[PDB]
C-alpha cells in the first residue's frame, strides 16, 4: 500500500496442496514492515 507517504508491506506464509496456486482456503495477512518514506509511487516492476 501507499497511504500518507508510508509504504506498508503485509505477508503471510500458508502451505498448499492443490495444483491450482490460489486455493479456496481463506487466511488473514499479518503486517511485516512499515516504511516512512515519502516518494511518489505510480509504477512497480518485479524482479527474478
Amino acid at each position: 500500500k501507499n497511504i500518507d507517504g508510508y509504504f506498508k508491506i503485509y505477508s503471510k506464509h500458508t502451505p498448499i496442496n492443490l495444483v491450482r496456486d490460489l486455493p479456496q482456503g481463506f487466511s488473514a495477512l499479518e503486517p511485516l514492515v512499515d516504511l516512512p518514506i515519502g516518494i511518489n509511487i505510480t509504477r512497480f516492476q518485479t524482479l527474478l
Binding site: 507517504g5 508510508y6 516512512p36 518514506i37 515519502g38
Partner: protein, 48 residues
C-alpha cells in the same frame, strides 16, 4: 615547476607548534526538513 604548483599543500603539526598551528578537529551536523515523516527524533520521557 615554474608557473605550475601542486593543487594540494600539507600542514605542519607538532606538539611544540603554536595555538594557531595546533591541530583541531571539526564536525558539522546538518538538518533537513523535506515532505517526509521524521525518522530522527530525540528521547521521549517515560514514567513508571
Amino acid at each position: 615547476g615554474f608557473n605550475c604548483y601542486f593543487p594540494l599543500q600539507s600542514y605542519g603539526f607538532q606538539p611544540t607548534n603554536g595555538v594557531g598551528y595546533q591541530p583541531y578537529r571539526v564536525v558539522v551536523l546538518s538538518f533537513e526538513l523535506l515532505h517526509a515523516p521524521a525518522t530522527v527524533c530525540g528521547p521521549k520521557k517515560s514514567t513508571n
